[PDB]
Amino acid sequence: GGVKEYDIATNGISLHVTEQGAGPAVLFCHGFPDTSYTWRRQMNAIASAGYRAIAPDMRGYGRSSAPADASLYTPLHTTGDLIGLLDALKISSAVLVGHDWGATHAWNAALMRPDRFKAVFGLSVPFVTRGESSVFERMRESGRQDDFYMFEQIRPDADQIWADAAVTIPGILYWASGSAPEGEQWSPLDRTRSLYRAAPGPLPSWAEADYVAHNIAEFRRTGFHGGLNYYRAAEPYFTLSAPWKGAKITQPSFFIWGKSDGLKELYPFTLQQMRAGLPGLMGGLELDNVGHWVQHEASAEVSEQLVRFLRTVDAVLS
Amino acid sequence: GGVKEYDIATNGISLHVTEQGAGPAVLFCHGFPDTSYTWRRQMNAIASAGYRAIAPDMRGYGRSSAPADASLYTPLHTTGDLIGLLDALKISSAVLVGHDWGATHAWNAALMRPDRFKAVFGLSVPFVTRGESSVFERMRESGRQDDFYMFEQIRPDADQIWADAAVTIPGILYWASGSAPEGEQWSPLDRTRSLYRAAPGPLPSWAEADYVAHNIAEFRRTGFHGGLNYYRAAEPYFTLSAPWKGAKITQPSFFIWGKSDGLKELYPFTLQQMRAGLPGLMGGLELDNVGHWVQHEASAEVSEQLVRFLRTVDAV
């Protein structure tokens, strides 16, 4: 027990890594705008269940390299980071845990190297197989150029409108959570209920003060340019993702989101319909009154499902 | 038999497709500077054996689209072409056949989608696992910047060096084949023995005249910019290929190359040793007095090994 930190040189960048425990490897990948610290509770839970929790700051974030160039933030780059990390630690294989962009990048990693990534535990962002159409193209041809939030994030000025971390980190934690009043919650197609609105006072009890303070400090130092580069890379990445047009993830998986997550408006399918695409799905979970920040809003039941999942993966793997 | 031609909209481009036969799908991939016509003898041989031979012009060549941007010619772009081609033909899976750059990209495609590419028959270019360093930095670190031919093909002005297809296409068919006097055959590390030296008179009898005429005609109309973009893409693609750093190809695989191919110099491993990156390798054949153009210099041998390989892959 107890978290250790170090830095790894992998895939042409420097990767800041935190880890805890011993036993089979579990690689945690956070999204926007988060850090490795987002996983401390789950790391501690699975470490006491006999697993090695490994959680880097993803590239763009924290004490990891954050190259200016948005073309460097496709799933090909971060999967190369995760391979080079497993290589550098002499780990043969790991189970993947992802949230937000980490979930998207993790889904891709599992497609690319099932020999190394033996299972995927996805949070908030469901796996959708690659299509004929990128999301940016559909939003444009259906008129949502001024509505689909990702366009606002891709703009170079998004750096500036996020920069005030003391305000924007508590704000996004609040307005994308199940705590914001219904009808006020962030929605991806409404420019008036933005992600970065100031929070209206103290954060709900589920938001651990040590975590909120940690991430405010990280993002006051780093800024948001690298995190926002994940959005800027997604459309250029549609061209390079064509090899996986109909590709499915067959290793065991598991999926959890919150029913109050505004993201759900973009995935109007059931949990039964996620097996087309994820045939190894061992079970899903829709949490009532949880928003986007499931590993904080429902910390204990995320830890719990992850422990149960890992044991089931152990049984399958044996 | 009976060869037919058509175009397919796939992956945001046009792909010119030739095909022959019916049966399990075999997908041919040519390299530089070639066209789909390079496979006609193999296509005909496997059509007679019960297979559907499909041989597109790869992107950058022939009647396929040929965007100027070199960044559009990675294995990611050509695998997307092939997945989209199979989809458009509503074929579930296929065996890959690849030569030269077609082999390198076929290798990578086998890695990316084993669910759609069930076996790999490679010519001239062996699969080696992606490592710590690209061929480009190994050559820089070791002082070969003026020796390694790829640096010259990558130059923008390589478009003009190649352009006289009536000269350069017989040139490379001769100098990179087993018919050139040894010691004078093309070498990837010898400036003085380039690939585009003119031929000394007419081509050896093994170079089928309809094949030679087809390629000269296509490259007179297209130029060589698209093909050369395959070299211009390899180094940037090294950054994008870091997912596959240790990756092995597990599908059944076969490898053929010619003993007199200058490219041997770049792969000093034994074909026993190629099992490391290709654990499902079922055989490797090195051909005496054959150079780079194995499917032409040894057309009947390549054809008979591919029929046998396809029959072994089928029964498994």
Swiss-Prot record, chain B:
GO terms for molecular function: hydrolase activity. It catalyses: an epoxide + H2O = an ethanediol; (R)-styrene oxide + H2O = (R)-styrene glycol; (S)-styrene oxide + H2O = (S)-styrene glycol; 3,4-epoxy-1-cyclohexene + H2O = cyclohex-3-ene-1,2-diol. Changing V125W: No significant change in substrate specificity toward linear aliphatic and aromatic substrates. The active site is at D100, Y231, H292. Keywords: Hydrolase. Residues 24-297 form the AB hydrolase-1 domain. It is an enzyme of class 3 (hydrolase). It comes from the Bacteria. Its EC number is 3.3.2.10. Homodimer. Catalyzes the hydrolysis of various epoxides into diols. In vitro, shows the strongest activity toward aromatic and cyclic aliphatic epoxide compounds, since it shows strong activity toward (R)-styrene oxide, (S)-styrene oxide, and 3,4-epoxy-1-cyclohexene, but very weak activity toward (R)-epichlorohydrin, (S)-epichlorohydrin, and 1,2-epoxy-9-decene. Belongs to the AB hydrolase superfamily. Epoxide hydrolase family. This is Epoxide hydrolase. It comes from Caballeronia sordidicola (Burkholderia sordidicola). The lineage of its organism: Bacteria, Pseudomonadati, Pseudomonadota, Betaproteobacteria, Burkholderiales.
